[PDB]
Structures are given as structure tokens and as C-alpha cells.
């Protein structure tokens, strides 16, 4: 928990990568060693969520390097994962098949289930919080950010509902608080944008929006799902199930065949599924 009197004698800032609620993540170099890292700025129990994050280890997590104090102001030091985007690396692939994506989910999930053996809930599990480490093509995805406990307060939330409500849980927009079951329906949104590049909530309209959400009323539209196997979507619906105790948990999507056995197809659905997230994710 290292001290600092000025977080700019520390660090020198470049810009954000991904804002949240009460909360910043800001690109920015180590002055006297010219590290680049991911800063995580709060400003207002909850310094045990980060205790703990410190001491969260996972290769699909961000390391939590450090956190800096400024009197009113905690600093979040991630690791910084350069990646790229999840999506923007789809699109960049030439072969993409729902055997990549399930490896894309298994790291996801397995990091969530970290975390929630842990008792850790990200709260913030979203696409852009998810990065590949490295720019290989190969690479670990890695959960980049978290969503801290102030993230269940009211404030928050309908922030989060303002935002981009398609990562959001049901339970979540319904002001209900947040749980473990949280994370796994935000793992289904991914995976199911993963499979065909499109948010499974899309409506023009705001109210029409929140409606199929709050009702977890989505499909598996033609073509896109057409070459997308059953056993893919089984897994998606127990993931994006709008009753938090019918959802799925890590372990439980993790025991999943589309996750655990062979079941995820070896066709490339990259034309489309790139096609779709270029259309939506620019």
C-alpha cells in the first residue's frame, strides 16, 4: 500500500483506457523507470477489495502490481495489457472458429472463477475490460479491469444501466445487487457476441433495450448462428439466463461441454462474426 504525495511525481498520464463509474483507468508511464501501466484512479471495506485484488494471481487477470495513496485518492497500478481489444483481435484473425472463442471463454471463465473463489465479484465484465496480453496470435486474454464494491451502489449502477446496458445483468439493471451470477451472465453476453459479433441486446430504442435484457430476451438470429453449434448456445442461455440462480457459475459453465469437452465447432465463422463487430464495435 505505498504512499505518494503527488500521483503525478509517480506516474506521468497519457490517456483513458476504459472509465467506469466513480473510477478512471488511465494509461501512464513510470517516471523513473518509464514503465507504461494501467492506472486504476479512485476518489471518494472497499480497501479490502483491493487488498484482496493485490493479491490476486491469474494469468487471465491483470496483476494488480500496486496501489498508491494521494491522501483523497487511491491508484490502482495494473499490469498493462497490450493486446489489443478482445474484438478488435477477432476481426484482425483470419481464422476464427467457436473453438477459439471457447478457448477465449475458458480463460474468461476460469479467471472469473478465480476470482469468485476468492469472493470477488467483477461487476464491470465487459469486452473492453477484456485484453489480449500480448500482441501474439496465440495470445492469454486478460480480465484488464474490475469492477470494485462501489460499483453495486445505486449511483453506479444506473450509470452502468446508462452506459452500455448490454453487459449489465438483468438482476443489475433491476437495482437488485449485484452476485457472483453477475459475472456469468456477462461471460454469456461475451461469449455470444464472440460467436457472432453482435450484442445480443440492440434495439434502437432505450426502453425497448433495457426490455430485452431485464427479459433476457435474445436469439440466436440467421445467418449468423446458423454454423454456430447447439451445444455453443446451450452453454450461451445457461450463461444469459435472466434468473441469477437458474445462471449458470463458472463451474458450472466451465464444466460445460462447449468448454470443457469437444464440442465447440472447428468452422471459421470470422468473415461474419468480424463482419458483425466492425458494424457494432468501431
Given at each position: 500500500w505505498?504512499?505518494?504525495?503527488?500521483?503525478?511525481?509517480?506516474y506521468?498520464?497519457?490517456?483513458?483506457?476504459?472509465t467506469?463509474?466513480?473510477?478512471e483507468?488511465?494509461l501512464?508511464?513510470?517516471?523513473?523507470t518509464?514503465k507504461?501501466?494501467?492506472?486504476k484512479?479512485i476518489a471518494?471495506?472497499?480497501?479490502?477489495?483491493?487488498?484482496?485484488?493485490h493479491?490476486i494471481?491469474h494469468?487471465?487477470i491483470?496483476?494488480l502490481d500496486?496501489?498508491?495513496?494521494?491522501g483523497?485518492?487511491?491508484?490502482?497500478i495494473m499490469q498493462?495489457v497490450?493486446?489489443?481489444?478482445?474484438?478488435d483481435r477477432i476481426?484482425?484473425?483470419?481464422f476464427y472458429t467457436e473453438?477459439?472463442?471457447?478457448?477465449?471463454?475458458?480463460?474468461?471463465?476460469?479467471a472469473?472463477?478465480?476470482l469468485h473463489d476468492?469472493?470477488?465479484?467483477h461487476?464491470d465484465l465487459k469486452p473492453?475490460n477484456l485484453?489480449?496480453?500480448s500482441?501474439?496470435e496465440?495470445?492469454?486474454?486478460?480480465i484488464?479491469?474490475f469492477?470494485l464494491?462501489?460499483m453495486?451502489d445505486?449511483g453506479?449502477?444506473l450509470?452502468?444501466?446508462?452506459?452500455?446496458?448490454?453487459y449489465?445483468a438483468?438482476?443489475?439493471?433491476?437495482?437488485?445487487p449485484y452476485?457472483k451470477a453477475?459475472?456469468?451472465?456477462?461471460?454469456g453476453?461475451?461469449?455470444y457476441?464472440?460467436?457472432?459479433?453482435?450484442?445480443?441486446?440492440?434495439?434502437?430504442?432505450?426502453?425497448?433495450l433495457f426490455e430485452?435484457?431485464?427479459?433476457a430476451?435474445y436469439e440466436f438470429?440467421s445467418?449468423?448462428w446458423?454454423?454456430?453449434?447447439?451445444?455453443?448456445?446451450?452453454?450461451?442461455?445457461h450463461?444469459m439466463?435472466?434468473?441469477?440462480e437458474?445462471?449458470?457459475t463458472?463451474e458450472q459453465?466451465?464444466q460445460?461441454?462447449?468448454?470443457?469437452g469437444?464440442?465447440?465447432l472447428?468452422?471459421?465463422?470470422?468473415?461474419?462474426?468480424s463482419?458483425?463487430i466492425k458494424?457494432?464495435?468501431?
Open positions: 505505498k504512499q505518494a504525495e503527488d500521483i503525478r511525481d509517480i506521468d498520464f497519457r490517456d483513458v483506457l476504459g467506469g463509474a466513480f473510477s483507468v488511465i501512464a508511464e513510470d517516471k523513473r518509464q507504461l501501466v494501467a492506472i484512479c471518494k471495506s472497499m480497501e479490502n477489495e483491493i487488498a484482496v485484488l493479491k494471481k494469468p487471465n491483470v496483476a500496486d496501489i498508491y495513496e494521494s483523497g485518492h487511491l491508484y490502482l498493462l497490450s493486446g489489443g481489444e478482445l474484438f476481426v484482425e484473425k483470419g473453438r477459439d472463442a471457447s478457448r477465449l471463454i475458458f480463460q474468461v471463465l476460469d472469473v472463477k478465480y476468492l469472493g470477488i465479484v461487476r473492453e485484453l489480449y496480453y500482441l501474439d496465440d495470445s492469454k486474454i486478460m484488464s479491469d469492477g464494491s462501489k453495486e445505486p453506479s449502477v450509470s452502468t444501466a446508462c452506459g452500455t446496458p448490454g449489465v438483468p438482476e443489475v439493471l433491476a437495482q437488485k452476485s453477475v459475472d456469468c451472465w456477462s461471460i453476453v461475451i461469449a457476441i464472440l460467436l457472432c459479433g453482435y450484442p445480443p441486446f440492440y434495439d434502437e430504442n432505450d426502453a425497448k430485452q435484457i431485464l427479459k430476451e438470429d445467418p449468423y446458423d454454423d454456430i453449434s447447439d451445444s455453443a448456445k446451450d452453454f450461451i442461455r450463461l439466463e435472466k434468473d441469477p437458474k445462471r449458470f463458472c459453465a466451465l460445460h461441454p462447449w468448454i470443457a469437444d464440442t465447440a472447428d468452422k471459421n465463422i470470422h468473415q461474419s462474426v463482419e458483425q458494424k457494432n464495435f468501431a
